[PDB]
Amino acid sequence: PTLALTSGSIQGTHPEGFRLPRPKTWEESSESALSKATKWYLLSEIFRGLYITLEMYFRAPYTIYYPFEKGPVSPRFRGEHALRRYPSGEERCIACKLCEAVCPAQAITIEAEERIDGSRRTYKYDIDMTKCIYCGYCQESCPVDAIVETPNVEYATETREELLYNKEKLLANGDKWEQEIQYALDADAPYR
């Protein structure tokens, strides 16, 4: 038999002790008048508050001297995009257009056809680096690891035209950062 008889539930029932006791009056304060006034007139907690702040003055600060030092990075970090190659030198991308279809922001533009020697290669490949949200979906979807995000973050440009990376630019990044891409790929290969 449940408490539907009184339109009550287990959930509606408050725990024991839920009702507050009678609030104390001025005659039930444990502190004497002088103790309460010595703390009040001599700013007891403020002088403590100063003292705790002064403890920090004799501690080692946290600041690092960028650009002479860098904060930690991990192999999964997402930064600047780069198009990679095989060791033999052929471009890794087979113009499969997967990354273009995942890309949440539609930052990728791929135009492809059969190469001069028959290969399935891309002749136009742009990333609108001012439209990308640096999300890593293109990297996850590439079947041949052709498009990755290098750990670079220091590439701020004076003009916005310089942030429209075309296929020449991205392949030049893949050559520049190939060694660092291998650092991250070797470390985080099994986790993908």
Binding site: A4, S7, S9, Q11, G12, A101, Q106, T109, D128
Partner: protein, 240 residues
């Protein structure tokens, strides 16, 4: 004062092959399904004049009412002791242009009393007004202000209905399906007028609609039957 352990080097458990049971996730809601079904019917029996129909999905009970049945059913669910939904969490809508009344106004009520949530669905058209629940729930003042801004629904009885999200003097209600996702206009700074001006929309890269390449095969089946065996009409058994 022993030196701190190097947590890298401490031993770790060894496991062979892992086993995890496979069972339907919808099964664990079975008890919740019957109780919402009972309590859903209870509201209908109490108010047959208003409750058109009720539906249960897993652990969510929906009550479908007409626009003229809104204030009545909302009041009943707020004041009745068996169902004290004092807190209204969400007021929204949805656009289904195929239906005669496209907009589908949905209310979510919370009962901190009995730890329950109920949903009210009431339809509306583009020109037909809907009663405002602001006199009951003060928390719907801005949720109704937002629904009008994004759906253009007329809310009758609202003390101050106005744009809350879109710009002042914004033409058109964005979440209506006929409104394009990129809108109609865009702004730029005009040197001659020394002020930011509106101009008609013109995209340097037109939006690409990859949604055309959707699935040509149906992807999910007809579903499964999880109605409690106490809410199905019995089959009249054959005679001897």
């Amino acid at each position: 004062e022993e030196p701190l352990p190097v947590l890298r080097d401490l031993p770790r458990p060894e496991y062979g092959e892992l086993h995890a049971p496979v069972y339907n996730p919808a099964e664990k809601y079975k008890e919740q399904i019957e109780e919402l079904h009972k309590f859903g019917r209870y509201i209908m029996g109490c108010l047959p004049k208003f409750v058109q129909q009720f539906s249960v999905w897993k652990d969510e009970l929906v009550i479908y009412v007409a626009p003229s049945a809104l204030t009545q059913v909302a009041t009943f669910l707020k004041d009745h002791t068996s169902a004290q939904f004092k807190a209204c969490m969400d007021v929204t809508a949805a656009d289904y242009p195929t239906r005669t009344n496209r907009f589908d106004v949905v209310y979510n009520l919370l009962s901190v009393r009995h730890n329950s949530r109920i949903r009210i669905k009431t339809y509306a058209s583009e020109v037909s007004p809907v009663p405002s629940v602001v006199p009951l729930f003060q928390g719907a003042n801005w949720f109704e202000r937002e629904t009008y801004d994004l759906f253009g629904i007329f809310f009758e009885g609202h003390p101050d209905l106005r744009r809350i999200m879109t710009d002042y003097g914004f033409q058109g209600h964005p979440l209506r399906k006929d409104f394009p996702t990129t809108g109609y206009t865009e702004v730029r700074y005009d040197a001659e007028k020394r002020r930011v001006v509106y101009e008609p929309l013109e995209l340097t890269q037109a939006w690409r609609n990859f949604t055309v390449g959707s699935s040509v095969w149906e992807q999910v089946g007809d579903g499964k039957d999880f109605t409690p065996e106490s809410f199905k009409l019995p089959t009249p058994a054959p005679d001897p």
